[PDB]
C-alpha cells in the first residue's frame, strides 16, 4: 500500500541518517579536530516520536509532535558506550531531556526509545535545560540542570520575565531519576555543575551567581544550600568572557590539574556572542587557577554560526577515555550538537603554552612579535 | 553594439530567472511542502524598474534605482491567476506595494509593469507595508496595511521612534485604489486584517492593540473606528508567541471552522525570533477558539534563516483553490518570498490532531510518551 | 558488535538506495522524459546476493560474489506491478536473468530474492541474455533470449569465437520456467522476439538473420512458426531494412515486442553503425499496419534516443539498448533501456506522443541536401509564425 | 495558454544559453588558453530548427527534427565578426553546413536563421563535411570539404563501404554558393585545404592522399592546380610525414589553412594513432617557409592539444579535430576545435606564442632514450637556475 | 616582477597538489579500499620537467616538454619509503621510466628530480614500458620491461607494426642501471616478470608467449633460466590459462611479481576481452603453491578489480592495469594500478583479506547455470541466517 510504503521510507531514510559515518575535518589548528557532520539534529529524533504511524488515526502521515532542536547536551561514558544527555526542544518551545548513545563517540548516536521522565520538585518548573552529568564518588550519577519558571513579580503583560533555580536529580541507570530539592541560594544561580570528588568531605559545586564562575561547598546534596562562595574564574573587560561566563561540563582530572571547559559571552551589534574557553585549577586546591590561556578555545565556524540563536557555541558535556582521547560535545547556535576530538595531553599543552592575555592591544602585539622573532630565526 | 548586447543580456537573464520551474522539496513533515526556490526576490523586479535603458542617459548601464527586498506579500486569487501584493523595499529603505502574478501559484511570478499607486490619507505616511487583501462580500477588495510615521513626541536626535496606523484602501481592479480614512483607535494597532464576511451586519477586523490577537466590529469601513475589542488568541509564557503575535492573512473558511495563519514572536540572545502558527475558530462564533495546536506551524529552515532581519518567517497572504489546494506565501528574514503548499484537509488535520500545549516540559514529555507507546505497540 | 553493526549499515544503505525517489529531467525534447537516476545498477542487487552475512565464514565481511552490471531488461506489467526481467552480469562475466519489481515503474525496483532458474535445452549454453517477454494470447508468458556457446570449430587459441541460438522458455508465474527447443534456423539468429498475437493462426517471430558479422543480413525479419514447441524458421520476410549512412547502417534489431495502438503496431528497435571508437548503438522507432504487421506505415528519420550524459560511459560505451517497455491502460508508456551495457534507465512518454513522433518526424530522404530541404521547410513555417 | 507559455520558455532558455559568457580556464600550459564552455553544441541550434512552433500541427510541442552534434567547423573573420562554418549533424545522421557568428570569438555564437544551401556537383553526395574556408587572393571565399558517397562496388549487405571526393564550392556572401567540379585525383583525397596565395601563379592545395585505409599514404601533401574550376591533382609532394610511435603514426591531415607569419606559414593539423579503444585523434603544429611553402622549418615534438576532461567523451570519443581558426590583426588567435565529433570549443593564443611554441619545443628524436636526454638537459638548466 | 610571480605560483600550486592528503572511499566491497585521488597524474611531474624557468629563453613561460600520462608503475619498498617505478608518457608519445617516492604509500608521491637513465641493449628500442621490479635473492633489483621496436618487415606505409622483447636491467640504487641482454625467445614475449627466488637453483620468469595477436598463446607461463645475464627461454609451462567467456578470454598477463604468503604465492594479473568498444582490461588474482610455484591452488572466479567511475575514462578507456604492489611486514598491502593508461591509483588491503578473497570467492563453473547455482546456494544460507 502507498501508506505502508511511505512509512517504510521514513524509517529507512532515518536509519541512513543515523548510521552515516562522520569524517574529521583535516584543516584544523592542531588543538581540536572538528567533524563534517553534527552528531545530533532535530532530524535525528526517532520517527516514532514525531509521526503517528497508524494509518487509521494519521492517514496523511504528518508529524504530530514537531521537534525543533537538539542542543546543550551533558555527556557520560556509560557501560562502554558514549552517551549524551540531550536537551531536546520541541516545536512547542519546551525542552526536555533525552539520552542518546553511540558505540564510538563521533557518530551513530541514537536516542533511547523513551526520553527522560524527570519528576518535579515541590515547585513545578516550566522549562528544564542544560543538564551536567557527574558520576560522583558517592556512587550516584547527578544531573544538575536549570529549572525555569515565570517571574511572579513581573508587571502584567510581561510574559517573558523568568526566574531559574539549579535543579538536582540523581540516578543509577539514567532511566529512573530521583528529584532532590532545588539548590537553595540567596543569589540566582545558573550553570551549576557538581565536582566529582568530595572536598573537605563535602560536595562541591561550580556556580554562577547572578563576578564569574564560583565554587561552593555543600554539606548535604539532598538538602543543598549555598553558603560561602569563592570566585575561581573571573570576567574581564574586552575578553571573550566580558559580560557573562559559566562552567560547561565538570572538569577532567589530569596529572597536571583539573582541566576546565567553560563558555564566555560578550555583547556585539548582533546580540550576545558565546564562545568556549578553557582554564586549569590545582589538584591540591581546586579553587586555585594554574592555567589561563588567552582568548577562546573554540568559536563558531561555518555552519555553526547560524541557527535559532546564532553566534553561539555552548558545551555542557565531554568524555575522556582511559587512553587520553577526549570527545567534546558542543552545541552550535542552540540548534544542533557537534563533536570535536582532542587528547588530554594536547588540551593540557594548549592550556599551559598558549600565552596568557596581557589585556591590551600593545601586550598582544608584544607576545606576537616574540613568537614571530623565534620563528623567523628558525626558518632562516 | 556593445551596449545593446548588454541590454539584451540583462533582459534575457531576467526572463530565464522569471520562468524557472520550481520544484517541491521532497523531505517534509507531511503537513506542508516547501519549494526549492523563492517565488520572489529583489532580482525578480523588472529590469526596467532598476536600469535606465537609454544609452544616451545611462552609457555605463548601471542601476538607477536599487531594489533591496520583496517580502510580506498579501495574496488573492484573481481572474484565474495567483496574485501577490508584494511589499517591495528599495535600496532607499522605503517600501511600496506592487502586484505580481503567476499562472500556477508556485513559479513564474512576474510583476505588473507599474507598482501600486496608493493615495495618502489626510496625514501623509513615510512607510507603508504588509498589506492584507480581503475580497469582502460587499464587492470590494480591501487592502489593510501598516502606515508608519515618525513619532512627533520623540526627543531631539531620536530619528527612530515611530507611530503606526492601520491604513485602509479598497479597489476593484488592483490598479485604482481609493484610500479610506486610517483606522481610528485608542491603542496603537498593527497586523490589522479584514474578515471577509459581515458579522452581525458589521465589518469585522482582526487587531493587535499595543494581550494578543483581537476582534473588533466596525459599523462603517469608510469611517472605521474601533470600539469594543475581544481577544481571540492569547500570548503565553514560554511558547512561540510569548512577546508578540499577530494575524497573518485573513482566515480560510472550512466546513470545520475558520482556519487561521498567524505569527508569534519571542526574544532570544540574537534578537526577536518570528515563526508561523495556526489556530481555528468557530463558524457560529468566529471569536471562539476551537483548535490550538501546540507550537509552530513553520519556522525558518536553511536559506530562510538568513537575511536583512534574520530568524524570521512572516505571512500575510495565502490562496485556497476550489479543489482544496492551499498556496501559502511567506517571507523569510524580511528579504524574499517563498511558497509552501498544502490542502485544507491536511491543514485542518494538523490543527485538530497536533496535541495542545500543556505549557511545561513535564506535560510535553507525557504527550510524547503517549505517542511513543502507541507507536511501539504498533511496530511490534 | 562491530561486525553486526557493519551488516546493519550495509542493509540500511541498501534500503536507502532502493527507496530513492526518481525525478524527471525537466530538459527534454517533448517526446520522451528522462529521469535523474538509473532504475537499476549492480549496486541494486541484494546485499545477500553479494556478501556472506555469517561472521563465522566471512569475518572480514567481504563480497563473495561480485555483481558487475544490470542491463538489457525485458519488461511486463504483472499483477499490478511493473516488472523487469533483468540481465544481470556477475564479476565472473556470466549473465543470468532475474526479476525485479516496482510499484510505480520509475523507482523502488527491487529484485526478487532469488534470480531466474532457467533449465538448459538439450545443448547447454555458456551465456544467456537479453530476454524479451511476450504475454501471448495462448496464455503463456514467453521469454525469447540469446543462448550463446563457444564455437568449437575455431582455430587453436581462439577462445572468443561464438555461436548463438534463440532460446525459448515459457512460464505462467515467472518462477517456474519450461525450456522449449532452441529455434531452428539456417542463419544465425539474434534479437528474436515473439509477436503477441497469432497471425494466420501461427506464431510470429521478429528475427534478425545474419551470416555470423551481419553480412547479407537485410534487417529485422518476420517469420511465421506453426508450433512454438518445435519452432523452426522457414520463410522469413524483411520488415525494417538497414540503410547506408543512417543510424541503422551496420546492424539493427527489434527491441521489445511492439505495442498495439489504434494506428498500428508501435515498434522500438536499436540501430548500429561503426565509428572510430567502435560500434555505436542508438534506439529508433517504426510502425507497421494492423491489417498486415509486415507492412511499414511509419519510418521517422534518425534516432529516437541516443546516449546522453552518464549514458555515454560504461563497460561498452556509446550504447543504448532496449528489450522491454510497458504501456498502461491510460496510455502512459515506460521505456526500459540500458546504457553502455552497464545500467538500466527508464524514460516515459505516452502512446499518443510516440505515435505523433512516428507519424510527424519527417522521413529520411537519405542525403544532406534532402535533410537541408526538410529543415528549410520547417524554418520557413516557423519564421512566418513568429512574425 | 499553457502551450504559448511552453514556447516562451523554450525561447527564453535558448537565449540564456546563447548569451552565456565564457570564462577562460586559468590552469593551462602557457601556450593555449582553454575555456569553461563549448562555443557550440547541438543545443545551440535554433529552437525553430528543431520544433514546429504551431500548436495546430504540433500540439504536444515535440521536436520534429532532432539535432545531434555541432562539430568540425571552418572559420573566417567576416565583416568584423567571428564566423564558424559549422558541420551540423542531425539525428538522421546526415551532416550539413551552417554559418554561426559571434561578436567576440569566444561566446555568443548564434546560427544564421537558415543553414547552408550547397548545390550538388554532377554526382550527388550522401554526406558532406569538414569545410575549410579560404579567403583566396582571387577574391573568392572557397570552401573545400569532403563529399561522401556509398561505394556501389561493395559485397552484398555492405552498406558501410564509402568513397569520398574533395568538394569545391565558392562564395562571396556565405549564402549563395557556387559548386565547382569535385577535385579529380588518382588517390582518394580527404582533408584537402586551399592555400590562400597563388604559388607560381597556380592554386595550391594541401592534400592527404590514401589508398582507401591510408596504406601507402605518406602524409600531408602539396599539389599545384592550374584552374580551380577544373581542379585535378597531377604531381603532389609530401610536406609533413607520418612517423612510427608519434602522435601522427596511422594518419594525419591538415586542419584549417595555415596562418602567414613573418617567420613562415603556421600550420595546425591532426594526427591519428591506433590504441585498444580505437583511433585517437590529437592536434599538432608545424611551420613551413615563406620562400618555399613546401619546406618544413619547424617540427615541435608531440601534440599541441589532446582531449582534456569533457573533451574526452562524445559520439566518437578520444578525438580532437580542427578545421578553422582566426588570427586578428593584433596577433590574437582563436582556435576552433571539435571534441569527440560532438561539440565545438575555442582555445586562445597569439601568433607570437604559437611561433614560440613551434620554434622552441624540442624536435622529436624518435626514441625513449632521446626523449630522456632532451628532458635531462632542461632539468639540468632549471636546477642550476633554481639554485 | 610579473614573470617571477608566475613562476612562484606554478611552484606553489604544484606543491599543494603534491602534498594533498588522500582519503579512502568508504563505499567498498570489503576486499579492497579505493582512494579519492590518483597517486600520480601527468600534472604531478615536476614543474621543472615541463617549463623552462628562465625568463631570457622562455619569456611567455610556456611548457617546453609536455607530459601526457603517468601509468603502469612498478613498485618496491625502498629504504623505508614507498616507491613507484613510473611509466611516464610524454606529449611526444614516448614513454620513459621515473622513480617517485612517498613516505606513506597513499599520497605525497614525488618524482626524483631526474628520471631513469636506461642504457640501450645492442639493438636500440623506440619505446620502453611497464617495468616490474624484483628484489631478487641474488642481491640485485631487476627491472623487467617491454622494449618495443618498429617491425622493419612491414608493408610500405605501415608505420604501426611493431615487435617487442623483454628488456632486462638491474640496479642496486635505482639510479645506475646495467642493461643485460634482451630475453631470447622463439615466441614474442610481453608481461615478463622475475620471480624473486631461485627455483631449482635457477632464475624463474613469468612469461606471456604469443604469436604476434595472441593466437596460440595459452596464458601466463613459467620459464626457468640458467643465467639472467644471458637469458633465454627454453621450456615454458603455462600456469594460468585463458578461458572462453571469462574476464581473461582474449589475453592475460602477470602484473607485479607475486607476494609470498604462508598459504602460497599471491598473484595479481590482468585479463582482456573484446567488446563493441574495443579491448577491456580488468585485474584478477590467483594463487600458486609454495612447494611448486607452477601449481595453481586458488582461482577465484571473475575480476578482482574493474574500472570504476573516473577510472573508466582516459587515453585508452575501459582499462585497469597493475605491475606494482607493496606488502609491509604488518600485512598491509598497497596495490598500485593504472586506469585507462592515463593515471596511477592506489588501493589498499591486507595479505589476510586478499588470501581470504582468493580462497573463498567461489571458482568459476564457466556457465550461467553454474553461476546461478553458486548464487542460489549463498542466498539460501543468508536467508536462513537473516530469519
Ligand atoms: O546562562 P548562559 O550561560 O547565559 O547560557 C544561556 O544562553 C545560551 C545561549 O543562548 C543557551 O545556550 C543556554 O541554554 C543558556 O540559556
Ligand atoms: O508587527 P510585527 O508583528 O512585530 O511584525 C514586524 O516585524 C516583522 C519582523 O521584522 C516584519 O516582517 C514586519 O513587517 C513587521 O515590521
Ligand atoms: O545483437 P546486437 O544487436 O548486435 O546487440 C549486441 O550488442 C549490444 C551492445 O553491446 C549488447 O547490448 C547486446 O546484448 C548484444 O550483445
Ligand atoms: O579523415 P580523418 O583525418 O581520418 O578524419 C576523420 O575522422 C575524424 C574523427 O572521427 C572526424 O572528425 C573527421 O570528420 C573525419 O571523418
Ligand atoms: O600486453 P598487454 O597485456 O596486452 O597490455 C598492453 O595493453 C595495455 C592496455 O592498453 C597497456 O596498458 C599495456 O602497456 C600494454 O600495452
Rounded Cα gap, residues D193 and D74, in angstroms: 11
Among E114, E225, E100, E121, smallest CA distance to E170 is for: E121
> Distance (Å, rounded) from C-alpha C259 to C-alpha E135?
66
Å between E1 CA and nearest CA of chain C: 44
| The dihedral sign for the CA sequence C224, C226, C230, C232 | negative
Task: Please report the DSSP string for A150-219 in residue order.
Answer: E-TTSPTT----EEEEEEEEEESSSSS-EEEPPPB-SS-B-S-EE-SS-BTTBEEEEE-B--EEEEEEES
Cell of E293: 610455484
Q: How many CB atoms lie within 10 A of CB B31?
A: 23
Can you read off the three cell numbers belonging to residue B61?
Answer: 548601464
User: A156 at the B interface (CB within 8 A)?
Assistant: no
- Looking at the CA of A276, name the nearest ligand: 1
Residue E56 phi, psi (nearest 5): -65, -40
Residue-wise burial string across D45-72, b where 16 or more C-beta atoms lie within 10 A, e elsewhere: bbbbbbbbbebeebebbbbbbbbbbbbb
Residue E165 has which C-alpha cell? 622483447
Counting beta carbons within 10 angstroms of the beta carbon of residue E135, is it exposed (0 to 12), middle (13 to 18) or buried (19 or more)? middle
Gap between the Cα atoms of B97 and B115, Å rounded: 6
Residues of B in contact with D108 (CB under 8 A): 5
**Distance between CA A220 and CA A204 in Å, rounded?**
10
**In contact, A288 and A264? CB cutoff 8 Å:** no
Beta-carbon-side half-sphere exposure of residue E325 (alpha carbons within 13 Å): 28
Q: B304 C-alpha vs ligand 1 centroid, how far in Å?
A: 24
Residue of A nearest to E21 (CA): A26
Comparing alpha-carbon positions, the chain A residue that sits nearest to B304 is A307
D108 vs B: CB within 8 A: yes
Q: Do C13 and A16 touch (CB under 8 A)?
A: yes
Residue of E119, E116, E4 lying closest to E56 (CA atoms): E4
Q: What are the start-end ranges of the H helices in C166-315?
A: none
Q: Check residue A152 and give left, alpha or beta (phi > 0: left; psi -120 to 50: alpha).
A: alpha
Bridge partner residues of B216 (DSSP)? B205
CA distances from D148 to C277, C367, D16, D145, D229 (A): 20, 10, 36, 10, 20
Which are the contacts of A269, defined by CB distance < 8 A and separation ≥ 6? none
Is E89's C-beta closer than 6 angstroms to any atom of ligand 5?
no
Nearest to E192 by CA among E235, E157, E142: E142
CA-to-CA dists, residue C248 to A365, C191, C219, C275, E48, angstroms = 78, 14, 9, 13, 51
Within 8 A of C58 by CB-CB distance, chain E residues are 360
* Binding partners of D (≥3 Cβ pairs within 8 A): B, C, E
C34 lines ligand 3 (CB under 6 A): no
Q: Report the alpha-carbon distance of residue D376 to residue D249 in Å, rounded.
A: 26
CA nearest D205: which of D261, D260, D253, D271?
A: D253
CB within 8 Å of E132: residues ≥ 6 apart: E74, E143, E144, E145, E192, E193, E194, E254, E255, E256, E257, E323, E324
Residue B22: DSSP 8-state: P
Contact call for B and E: 3+ CB–CB distances under 8 Å: no
Chains D and E touching, counted as 3 or more CB pairs less than 8 Å apart: yes
Q: Specify whether the CB–CB gap between B197 and B137 falls below 8 A.
A: yes
Distance from CA of E316 to the nearest CA of C (A): 11
D61, D95, D160 member nearest C249 (Cβ) = D160
Decide: A47 and A18 in contact? Cβ < 8 Å.
Answer: no
Distance set, CA B117 to CA B44, B69, B98, B169 (Å) = 20, 19, 9, 11
Nearest CB neighbour to E316, from listed D275, D357, D381: D275
CB of D154 within 8 Å of any CB in chain B? no
In the three-class reduction of DSSP (H, G, I as helix; E, B as strand; rest coil), residue A234 is classed as strand
In short, whether C339's Cβ falls inside 6 Å of ligand 3 is no
How far separated are the first and last CA of chain B, in Å rounded? 74
Question: CA E177, CA E196: separation in Å to the nearest integer?
Answer: 18
C-alpha cell of residue B10: 540583462
What CA–CA distance (Å, rounded) separates C368 from C223? 35
Ligand 2 atom at minimal distance to the Cα of residue B274: 9
CB pairs under 8 A between C and E: 164
D321 within ligand 4 shell (Cβ under 6 A):
yes
Burial class (CB in 10 A: 0-12, 13-18, 19+), E12: exposed
Question: D376: alpha, beta or left, given left = phi > 0 and alpha = psi -120 to 50?
Answer: alpha
Closest-approaching ligand to the CA atom of B87: 2
Instruction: State the SS3 of D164-206.
Output: EEEEEEEECCCCCCEEECCCECCCEECCCEECCCCECCEEEEE
* Ligand nearest to the CA of residue A275, numbered in listed order: 1
Decide if E206 contacts E192 (C-beta within 8 A).
yes
Closest residue by CA, ligand 3 atom 3: C253
Contact E344, E294 (CB under 8 A): no
3-state per-residue secondary structure call for C358-375 = HHHCCECCCCHHHHHHHH
Cα B307 off chain centre by: 16
Q: Around Cβ E68, how many Cβ atoms within 10 Å?
A: 23
3-state secondary structure of D64: coil
Q: Which residues of C touch E349 (CB under 8 A)?
A: none
Pick from A61, A86, A91, A130 the residue to mutate for testing the B interface (most B CBs within 10 Å): A91
Residues of chain A with a following break (C to N over 2.5 Å): 210
| C-alpha closest to that of C351 among C27, C31, C25 | C31
Beta bridge partner(s), residue A280 = A259, A291
- Phi, psi for A365 (deg, rounded to 5): -65, -40
Pairwise CA distance, residues C27 & C15, whole Å: 29
DSSP H or E segment with residue A7: helix A2-19
**Atom number of ligand 3 nearest to Cα C316:** 10
Give the separation between CA D52 and CA C197, rounded to whole angstroms: 37
Rounded distance between C-alpha atoms, residue B220 and residue A124, angstroms: 49
Joined grid coordinates for residue C244: 547506408
Ligand 4 geometric centre to CA of B92 (Å): 61
> Nearest CA to C73 among C325, C360, C381?
C325
Q: How far apart are CA D159 and CA D307, in angstroms?
A: 31
Please give the CATH topology (third level) of the domain spanning C1-387: Tachylectin-2; Chain A (2.115.10)
The preferred substitution site among D256, D279, D281, D337 for testing ligand 4, maximizing ligand atoms within 8 Å of CB, is D281
Q: How far does the centroid of ligand 1 lie from the alpha carbon of residue A271, in Å?
A: 13
Whether residues C21 and B26 touch (CB distance < 8 A) is answered with: yes
Task: Retrieve residue B239's grid coordinates.
Answer: 511558547
CA-nearest of D181, D358, D336, D320 to D256 is D336
Closest CA to C52 of E28, E374, E373, E379: E379
List CB contacts (< 8 A) between E23 and chain A: 23
Q: Cα E168 to the chain's mean position, in Å? A: 16
Nearest CA to E284 out of C106, D384, C68, D253 is that of C68
CA proximity to D62, closest of C377, B23, C331, C352 = C352
Q: For residue E26, give how far its alpha carbon lies from the nearest alpha carbon of chain A (Å).
A: 9
Q: Are E274 and E251 in contact (CB under 8 A)?
A: no
B118 Cβ contact partners less than 8 Å away, ≥ 6 residues apart: B96, B97, B128, B169, B177, B179
- Nearest atom in ligand 3 to C341's CA: 12
Contact at 8 Å (CB) between C306 and C313? no
Residue position matching grid coordinates 556509398: D150
The beta-carbon neighbor of D16 closest among B5, B13, B108 is B13
This structure's resolution (Å) is 1.7
Torsion angle, alpha carbons of E211, E217, E219, E224, to 10: -70
Element (H, E) at D143: strand D141-150
- CA–CA gap between residue C374 and residue D66 (Å, rounded): 12
CA dihedral A343, A349, A350, A355 (to 10 degrees): 180
Residues making up chain B, counted from first to last: 380
The secondary structure of chain E, three-state, reads CHHHHHHHHHHHHHHHHHHCCCCECCCCCCCCEEECCCCECHHHCCHHHHECCCCCCCCCCCECCCEEEEEEEEEEEECCEEEEEEEEEECCCCEEEEEEEECCCCCCCEECCCCCCCCCCCCCCCEEEEEEEEECCCCCEEEEEEEEEECCCCCCCCCCCEEEEEEEEEECCCCCCEEECCCECCCEECCCEECCCCECCEEEEEECEECCCCCCCCEEEEEEECCHHHCECCCEEEEEECCCCCCCCCEEEECCCCEEECCEEEEEEEEEEEECCEEEEEEEEEEECCCCCCCEEECECCCCECCCHHHHCCCCCCEEEEEEEEECCCCEEEEEEEECCCEEEEEEEEHHHHHHHHHHCCECCCCHHHHHHHHHHHHHHHHHHHC
In this structure, chain C runs to a length of 387
C8 vs A16: CB contact, 8 Å cut-off? Answer: no
Q: Which of chain E's residues have a Cβ under 8 Å away from the Cβ of C62?
A: 29-31, 353, 356-357
Beta-ladder partners of A129: A146
Q: Flag whether residue D317 sits within 8 Å of chain C, measured between CB atoms.
A: yes
User: A12 contacts in C (CB within 8 Å)?
Assistant: 12, 15-16, 19
Enumerate residues lining ligand 2, CB below 6 A: B 72, 129-130, 190-191, 244, 246, 263, 265, 274, 309, 312, 314, 334
Q: Where are the domains of chain D?
A: 1-387
Angle, CA B254 vertex, CA B249 and CA B255 arms, to 5°: 160
Residue E125 neighbours by CB distance under 10 Å: 21
Chain D, 159-218: which have a CB under 8 Å from a chain C CB? Answer: 159-160, 162
Distance, in Å, from the CA atom of E319 to the CA atom of E313, rounded to the nearest integer, reads 8
What is the number of the ligand closest to the CA of B265?
Answer: 2
Distance of CA C266 to the CA centre of its chain: 15
CA distance readout (Å), D270 to C139, C372, D248, D273? 60, 29, 7, 10
Given an 8 Å threshold on Cβ–Cβ distance, is C12 in contact with A9? no
Q: From start to end of C259-319, where are the E strands?
A: 259-261, 264-275, 278-288, 296-298
Measured between CB atoms, does D241 come within 8 Å of chain E?
no
Going from the C-alpha of A316 to that of each of A81, A192, D174, D230, the distances in angstroms are: 18, 10, 77, 93
Could you tell me which CATH class the domain B1-380 is placed in? mainly beta
Considering CB atoms only, which of E29, E273, E312 is closest to C66? E29
Apex E226 CA angle, E220 and E229, nearest 5: 95
Taking the C-alpha atoms of residue A50 and residue D190, their distance in angstroms, rounded to an integer, is: 71
Cα–Cα nearest to C333, from C350, C346, C312, C347: C350
Alpha helices by DSSP H, C57-135: none
Closest CA to C273 of B186, A282, D367, D162: D162
Amino acid at each position: 500500500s502507498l501508506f505502508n510504503d511511505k512509512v517504510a521510507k521514513l524509517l529507512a531514510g532515518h536509519e541512513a541518517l543515523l548510521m552515516r559515518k562522520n569524517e574529521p575535518v583535516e584543516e584544523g589548528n592542531g588543538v581540536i579536530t572538528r567533524y563534517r557532520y553534527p552528531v545530533l539534529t532535530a532530524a535525528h529524533t526517532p520517527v516514532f516520536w514525531r509521526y503517528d504511524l497508524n494509518e487509521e488515526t494519521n492517514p496523511f502521515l504528518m508529524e504530530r509532535i514537531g521537534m525543533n532542536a537538539t542542543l546543550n547536551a551533558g555527556a557520560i561514558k556509560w557501560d562502554g558506550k558514549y552517551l549524551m544527555l540531550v536537551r531536546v526542544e520541541g516545536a512547542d518551545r519546551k525542552s526536555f531531556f533525552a539520552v542518546a548513545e553511540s558505540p564510538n563517540g563521533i557518530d551513530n548516536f541514537r536516542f533511547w526509545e523513551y526520553p527522560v521522565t524527570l519528576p518535579e520538585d515541590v515547585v513545578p518548573a516550566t522549562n528544564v535545560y542544560d543538564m551536567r552529568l557527574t558520576a560522583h564518588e558517592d556512587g550516584w550519577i547527578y544531573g544538575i540542570f536549570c529549572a525555569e519558571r515565570h517571574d511572579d513579580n513581573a508587571p502584567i503583560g510581561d510574559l517573558s520575565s523568568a526566574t531559574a533555580t539549579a535543579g538536582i536529580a540523581r540516578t543509577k541507570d539514567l532511566k529512573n531519576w530521583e528529584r532532590l530539592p532545588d539548590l537553595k541560594t540567596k543569589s540566582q544561580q545558573r550553570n551549576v555543575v557538581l565536582h566529582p570528588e568530595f572536598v573537605d568531605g563535602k560536595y562541591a559545586l561550580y556556580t554562577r551567581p547572578q563576578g564569574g564562575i564560583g565554587w561552593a561547598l555543600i554539606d548535604d546534596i539532598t538538602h543543598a544550600e549555598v553558603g560561602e562562595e569563592k570566585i575561581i574564574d573571573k570576567r574581564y573587560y574586552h575578553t571573550i568572557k566580558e559580560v557573562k561566563n559559566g562552567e560547561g561540563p565538570h572538569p577532567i582530572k589530569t596529572p597536571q590539574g583539573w582541566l576546565h571547559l567553560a563558555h564566555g559571552v560578550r555583547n556585539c551589534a548582533a546580540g550576545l556572542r558565546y564562545v568556549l574557553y578553557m582554564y586549569m585549577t590545582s589538584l591540591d586546591d581546586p579553587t586555585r587557577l594554574i592555567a589561563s590561556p588567552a582568548g577562546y578555545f573554540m568559536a563558531p565556524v561555518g555552519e555553526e554560526r547560524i541557527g535559532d540563536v546564532s553566534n553561539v557555541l555552548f558545551s555542557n558535556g565531554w568524555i575522556a577515555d582511559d587512553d587520553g582521547k577526549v570527545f567534546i560535545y558542543y552545541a552550535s547556535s542552540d540548534t544542533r550538537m557537534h563533536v570535536a576530538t582532542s587528547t588530554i595531553e594536547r588540551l593540557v599543552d594548549y592550556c599551559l603554552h598558549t600565552p596568557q592575555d596581557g589585556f591590551s592591544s600593545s601586550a598582544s602585539v608584544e607576545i606576537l612579535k616574540n613568537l614571530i622573532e623565534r620563528n623567523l630565526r628558525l626558518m632562516k
